[PDB]
């Protein structure tokens, strides 16, 4: 049989200057973990790459170094954005094969995200920690653990799908005849889960003809909510700069409000603080106000290096990814989401959640 | 051959009290007109009733009253709500035929607007000025008039599908076998306007297979417009109060956003100002009021009674309703909207706007 929960276990940092606390695997634990297994290969992909910035990210790097002289085949991959460090790390680990990746050579908008590792086809990690020291080690992360084969092997064929797109000669990202001959293959989605755990995808022109959008599995979890919706992500305001002009998409903004308001949700939102200057955050947040004066809209905000991108639904399913709920992310980048409905690992992020809503450093919305 | 604009012009309400001005036909000149050319039939479909409160409505329903005695079949469609006038009406003109509609007596939420004449299939006035003293005397309408057969007898069946939902025994509105048994016929849409004039209707369980939902029509030309969006309406809130319960429906709302910010559109709204009290429109003012600043959106308000529902798109197509922007409205509501691309009466409606928008009686927005 499959195990419930695919052998899921939530992975965060608490840095030590924070009052956060739990006995989940760490991420310093978990990377440690990765490296210390591995047989056959160890996949990486995240934005930028900058394990030196931290004690123990440094640890991890020198970890990862070892594993490449002793023979196994590690593969970084890093948007062509996070391109600075590159020399400081090819000088560290001449045998750790480090790739950039442009997912969007048309427009030059979809950066790489995904955030996630994966060795030999039986363990992986999927979250929002990137492969830099401050996500290791000073800034608060949130991920999940897995052991299980089948769903490790799955999250493999999403970096089969990013290498693709390396910035070499005629590749994927270079030639739009090798592009659709890309095997964007999935094994387990929103229709056939693996123990109550599936992984959602995006941005769209990537998805292929299998794989979920996570845009389209996201809005349709918060249409459905009965009773409760709990968010902890960066910000929430519908509208986003792209390049140099501001993009209005309030896709994910509206389907909260209209569960709060049309369905009595009880909803929390546990945001960012925002720039006292930009008048699309000042606006959203006068919005939000006045919707916790009427309906059971809480909010409240945070001001510490924050990288958790959670969503709970009814305690029923569990969103954990690397990208923000906003239109710059859900049309152009490129990244993996877990989803959980699995209601023992569900329990465990909605402990989270009580947690981090209660924390000195989350103080109430006030404007 | 067919005439351009299909006859149609301009007829406004412009009270003695207010300071705009205009060459028009007067609603009260209108009226007066299709009363007098009468010859078979004169139906009249309105929310509510109530000719005797001012000294023109009394006028329009002497003549009326004349017409019925002189052998003329006058049918005066009333919402159900607005029934406590109908005894003075009937004990005044005891000739003409008055019926009550419900058209949602499945939820009590729909109500009658329609707000247009129609007589002989020969004339008919549509627009926002209902059958009372107010709307034709005190209050700021906005409608057109035709004398073009083709046109008038595609709204004589508007007239057609309300009248089926009369309270009286099994009829459309007390038996769904009935109701389905409704030819809810029209002539013209946008794919097939007559003189680039053509109706759209709401709301959509009345709509039948052949005429347009006045949402999808309205939504449409808002995300296609490329330049200019002129609104004159009652409010633009995306929230609004059925029953006694908050409804959250931001389709328009949203649809002019995306044209401001993603497009760059020159848009100015005239609304009517909001009640302090009301959260839902203090937290859209100060939104929009946002907005002004970093967008060309600019918004004005008016405080006089003013029953104007114009829009105008790139000074090429012009929608003028009885109803107004909201989710209530286009929801459940059933009303004729009059839409119109004829270049030369788009740019009358253009320069009522361009009245309006310097009026006295138009402040700019200040929170």
């Not at 590159?86 to 000088?91: A, D, M, N």
């Not at 919706?229 to 509206?254: F, K, M, Q």
């Not at 720039?275 to 945070?302: E, G, H, I, P």
Request: one cysteine or more.
């Amino acid at each position: 049989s499959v195990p419930a929960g695919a052998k899921c276990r939530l992975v965060e940092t608490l840095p030590e200057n924070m009052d956060f606390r739990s006995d989940h695997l760490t991420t310093f634990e978990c990377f440690n973990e990765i490296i210390t297994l591995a047989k056959k290969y160890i996949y990486i992909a995240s934005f930028c790459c900058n394990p030196l910035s931290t004690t123990r990210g440094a640890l991890i790097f020198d970890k990862l170094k070892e594993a490449s002289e002793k023979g196994i085949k590690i593969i970084v991959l890093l948007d062509e954005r996070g391109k600075r460090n590159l020399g400081e790390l090819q000088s560290h680990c001449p045998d750790i094969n480090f790739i950039t990746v442009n997912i969007d050579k048309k427009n030059n908008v979809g950066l790489l995200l995904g955030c996630f590792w994966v060795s030999d086809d039986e363990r992986c990690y999927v979250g929002n920690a990137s492969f830099t020291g401050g996500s290791i080690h000073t800034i608060k992360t949130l991920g999940v653990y897995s052991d299980y084969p089948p769903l490790a092997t799955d999250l493999r064929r999403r970096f089969d799908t990013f290498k693709a797109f390396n910035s070499a000669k005629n590749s994927a990202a270079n030639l739009a005849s090798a592009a659709a001959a890309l095997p964007v293959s999935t094994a387990y989605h929103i229709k056939n889960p693996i123990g109550g755990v599936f992984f959602t995808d995006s941005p769209e022109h990537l998805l292929g003809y299998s794989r979920d959008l996570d845009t389209d599995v996201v809005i349709d979890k918060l249409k459905s909510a009965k009773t409760s919706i709990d968010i902890e992500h960066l910000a929430i305001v519908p509208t986003t700069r792209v390049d140099g002009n501001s993009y209005y998409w309030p896709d994910i903004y509206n389907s909260i409000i209209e569960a709060a308001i049309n369905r009595g949700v009880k909803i929390r939102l546990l945001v960012g603080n925002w720039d006292k200057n930009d008048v699309y955050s000042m606006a959203t947040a006068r919005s939000l106000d006045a919707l916790c004066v009427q309906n059971d809209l809480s909010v409240k905000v945070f001001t510490i290096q924050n990288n958790t991108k959670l969503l709970i639904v009814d305690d029923e399913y569990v969103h954990i990814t690397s990208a923000n709920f906003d239109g710059t992310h859900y049309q152009n980048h490129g990244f993996v989401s877990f989803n959980s409905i699995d209601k023992q690992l569900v329990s465990e992020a909605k402990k989270i959640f009580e947690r981090d809503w209660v924390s000195s450093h989350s103080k109430s919305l006030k404007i």
